[PDB]
Structure 1
Amino acid sequence: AVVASSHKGKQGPSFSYGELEKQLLQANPILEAFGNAKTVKNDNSSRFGKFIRINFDVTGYIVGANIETYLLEKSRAIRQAKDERTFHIFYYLIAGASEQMRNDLLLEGFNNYTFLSNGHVPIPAQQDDEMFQETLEAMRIMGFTEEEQTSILRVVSSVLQLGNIVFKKERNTDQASMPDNTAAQKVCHLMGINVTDFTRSILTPRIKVGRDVVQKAQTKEQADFAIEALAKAKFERLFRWILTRVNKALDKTKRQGASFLGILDIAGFEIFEINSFEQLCIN
């Protein structure tokens, strides 16, 4: 981002780089916040594999760039092992949000969430409030509007809150019920859908199987599985949106180029008390 830069015709580390280099140097802290977590091996452990490339003209100066990102260890985020953390953005939001923001997002402080095993887990050297400020400012430098920032906060709040939709099973029927319908009401409000349909589609859904559309018998465990799967779906969609949005910032550049230089950064060899498929592909 300094050697490959073309000169505009206009010395130190506060030098004013080009627009694409400025985006590139902000892409790293953006992706790290959303994609890294604490593990027994590493406090800043990347949950994902990545590949950067920069494109050059015939003169030998940078004219474009691309950021590819591969499947991530998404499972851990609501099934936390002892002294391990979720994605840094969650702690940064829960700590850093103003009272105004907290009311807008219907958020609470730590340990108020079923999806947060071990409760709050600390991390050295970081300052959660300050990090929350700088990551949002990095998104502003990446040319985000205030709405497309707060919308991310709404969805990430939604996956955090939806864990609080607690179920209890009716022994006379083995079907799930929802005594804490307040949680579901909060979630469906944040999603802008009907509470009645949201409640019944979780507890006793009607599903189309070929020709017929039939009432699915639904256990406590199946309801739990359904809402956790919904959290995974929301997370994958939001991460996909982030990755596309950051690339589209670069995609202003033209399709021409002479050659390119790549940078590969895959998550390392990794092992702990459990070894499921989610670790195996990386290893």
Structure 2
Amino acid sequence: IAGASEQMRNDLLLEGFNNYTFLSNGHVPIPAQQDDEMFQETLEAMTIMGFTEEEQTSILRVVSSVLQLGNIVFKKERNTDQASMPDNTAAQKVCHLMGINVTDFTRSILTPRIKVGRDVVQKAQTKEQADFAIEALAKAKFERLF
């Protein structure tokens, strides 16, 4: 978010500090290290290890889709109770750095065409069921990344 150059600031899809809900305590500063330049540094360090000409921006994207997932807010639509999701950049900026299927991310995240027994079972998810699962997805992508 800090050492973004204007091209990949709009490519790797950067809004400013606190436009991510999953970054709490706002932006806490660190003593005697300034995240701003520390970005630029680590990018060099990549090129020294031989992280590829494109690959550097790819690691940075996976990160930023994780940064992104927490705009996915579920409001209790209270006439199923099985409530769904208003914004799309919440998922969009996530899934352009994902490139999974855009249709099917949310259509999974709302209707699990899942499995009870050993066959295909449909259900709409509740507000509650939808939040918790997407949350797991947000974090789990950073683990897969590491």
Question: TM-score normalised to the size of structure 2?
Answer: 0.91
Runs of 4 or more consecutive aligned structure 1 residues displaced over 4 Å after TM superposition? none
CA shift digits 1:132-168 (9 cap, x unpaired): 1111111111111121111101100000011111112
Partner of residue 88 from structure 2, selected from 181, 194, 206: 181
Give me the whole-angstrom Cα distance separating, in 2, the residues matched to 1:192 and 1:217: 24
Q: Deviations over 1:80-134 (max 9, x none)?
A: xxxxxxxxxxxxxx11111111111111110111212221111110122221111
TM-aligned CA deviation for residue 222 of structure 1? 1.9
Distance 1:130 1:111 in 2: 19
Larger radius of gyration: 1
Matches of 2:93 and 2:38, distance apart in 1? 27
List per-residue Cα deviations over 1:242-268 (Å, max 9, x = no partner).
xxxxxxxxxxxxxxxxxxxxxxxxxxx
CA contact (8 A) 2:74 2:83 kept: yes
Separation of aligned partners in 1, 2:44 and 2:132:
36
Question: How many Å separate the matches in 2 of 1:180 and 1:197?
Answer: 16
User: Do the aligned residues in 2 keep the contact of 1:204 with 1:217 (CA within 8 Å)?
Assistant: yes
8 Å CA contact 1:170, 1:176 repeated in 2: yes
Residue 148 in structure 1 maps to residue 55 in structure 2: yes
CA distance in 1, matches of 2:34, 2:73: 32
Give the % identical residues: 99
**Contact 1:175-1:204 within 8 A present in 2 as well:** no
Q: Is there any run of 5+ residues in structure 1 with no aligned partner, and where?
A: 1-93, 239-283
How far off its partner does 1:217 sit?
Answer: 4.1
Kept in 2, the 8 Å contact 1:176–1:204? The answer is no
Post-superposition Cα deviations, 1:158-187, rounded to whole Å, max 9, x if no partner, equal 000111111122211111211112321232
Conservation of the 8 A alpha-carbon contact between 2:111 and 2:123: yes
TM-score by length of 1: 0.49
Specify the alignment match of 2:17 in structure 1. 110
Residue by residue over 1:13-46, the C-alpha shift from the partner in whole angstroms, topping out at 9 and shown as x without a partner, is xxxxxxxxxxxxxxxxxxxxxxxxxxxxxxxxxx
Cross-structure match for 1:227? 134
In the aligned structure 1, how far is the partner of 2:132 from the partner of 2:72?
12
Tell me the alpha carbon deviations over residues 192-220 of structure 1, each in whole angstroms, 9 at most, x when there is no partner.
13322111111121102232211234222
CA distance in 2, matches of 1:131, 1:189: 26
Query: d(CA) in 1 for partners of 2:31 and 2:58?
Result: 29
Aligned counterparts of 2:12 and 2:27: Cα–Cα separation in 1: 19
State whether residues 165 and 180 of structure 1, in contact with CA within 8 Å, keep that contact through their aligned partners in structure 2: yes
Post-superposition Cα deviations, 1:35-92, rounded to whole Å, max 9, x if no partner, equal: xxxxxxxxxxxxxxxxxxxxxxxxxxxxxxxxxxxxxxxxxxxxxxxxxxxxxxxxxx
Higher strand share: 1
